[PDB]
A paper describes a structure:
Here we report a new antimicrobial peptide belonging to the cathelicidin family, cathelicidin-MH (cath-MH), from the skin of Microhyla heymonsivogt frog. Cath-MH has a single α-helical structure in membrane-mimetic environments and is antimicrobial against fungi and bacteria, especially Gram-negative bacteria. In contrast to other cathelicidins, cath-MH suppresses coagulation by affecting the enzymatic activities of tissue plasminogen activator, plasmin, β-tryptase, elastase, thrombin, and chymase. According to the amino acid sequences of known frog cathelicidins, the predicted mature cath-MH sequence (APCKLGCKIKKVKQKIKQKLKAKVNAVKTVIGKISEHLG) possessed 12 strongly basic residues distributed across the entire molecule, resulting in an 11 charge at pH 7.0.
The small trigonal-shaped crystals of the peptide were successfully grown under Crystal ScreenHT (Hampton Research) conditions of 2 M ammonium sulfate over 60 d at 277 K. While cath-MH crystals diffracted X-rays to 1.95 Å resolution, the crystal structure was solved at 2.20 Å resolution because the initial resolution did not provide a complete non-protein 2Fo - Fc electron density map. The peptide crystals belonged to the rhombohedral space group R32. The crystal asymmetric unit contained one molecule of the peptide with a solvent content of 41.76%. Loop-1 was formed by the first four amino acids A1-K4 at the N-terminal part of the structure, and loop-2 contained the last four amino acids E36-G39 at the C-terminal part. Non-protein electron density was interpreted as 13 water molecules and two chloride ions. The stabilization of the α-helical monomer was provided by a disulfide bridge formed from sulfur atoms of C3 and C7 and by several H-bonds between O atom C3 and Nζ atom K8 at 3.15 Å; between O atom Q25 and Oγ1 T29 at 2.70 Å; between O atom of I31 and Oγ S35 at 2.92 Å; and between Nζ K33 and Oε1 E36 at 2.68 Å distance. Further stabilization was realized by interactions between Sγ atom C3 with Nζ atom of K11; O atom of Q14 and Oε1 Q18; and Nζ atom of K17 and Nζ atom of K21. The monomer was more positively charged at the N-terminus than the C-terminus and shared high secondary structural similarity. Finally, compared to cathelicidin-PY, cath-MH contains a larger helix and five extra hydrogen bonds.
Residue numbers in the entry: 1 to 39
């Protein structure tokens, strides 16, 4: 496990990116729901 500071910064960035992407995905899903025409 030779993960030094540059490596640690990457881990943190990826965690944040991952969470924010899930939020976007959540929001886009809902955009899709309302973009449906009735019937
Ligand atoms: Cl975050
Ligand atoms: Cl996307």
């Amino acid at each position: 496990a030779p993960c030094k500071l540059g490596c640690k910064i990457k881990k943190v960035k990826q965690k944040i990116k991952q969470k924010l992407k899930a939020k976007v995905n959540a929001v886009k899903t809902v955009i899709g729901k309302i973009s449906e025409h009735l019937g």
